[PDB]
Amino acid sequence: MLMVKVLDAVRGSPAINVAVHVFRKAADDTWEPFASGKTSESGELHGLTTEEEFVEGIYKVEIDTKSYWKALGISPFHEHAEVVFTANDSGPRRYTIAALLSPYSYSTTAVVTNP
Template identity: 40%
Template sequence: MSTQRLQHLKGHILPENKVISMAGPVSPLSTHVLNVAMGVPGSNVSLSLQRQDTLSDNWSVITTGVTNADGRCPGLITKEMFTSGVYKLRFETQQYWESIGETSFYPYVEIVFTIRDPGQKYHIPLLMSRFSYSTYRGS
């Protein structure tokens, strides 16, 4: 196992390395990108969060972001903006794979989901390799 990977794991395991961020309100929607082929977080993955207009079926971009070193993108949406409806997370996977010197079958991944109770917490992970991906509703 590489030294870099061991240091990354150490940061998750040892309590003295934990840092609690008080930077702002917690988003009711979170995501986590994992490169399961290499066993590392999917860092620097560009993504966008979009909401579908119920009248026209058009998509509106709510926010864009890039995953951090842990494969997360904090602060996707505020509680006030998080309403019932159909949402889409779009991950620019081709750019990610090219940035680490690889090719992939999927140029992007779109995960479309319905929010019926915006008072709940939703977690939508993306587990990916060059030739596959999966997702699930976490909490």
């Protein structure tokens, strides 16, 4: 129900091998590790969670943009990109978090559909 897609705006391609970490805000206001992975050759990361596990709450997706650019020999501006949102407050949805990367800029968009 949670998918991440990363695109490279310099090369016009999927962003491959980008580390992604997902956290859920605990009752004590701490970030608990929730899931992680790396984008595939299509720049996508699936299978982060299940419907039973993906309960109502505030989630943070942290995308390691810095390592990505370093490996291309580019010194980027941001340390990482993070996306923080309340999920599921009126029932289960499918969430797609898209990011579009340039060295000194990024865009992030959410597409939310009802399964």
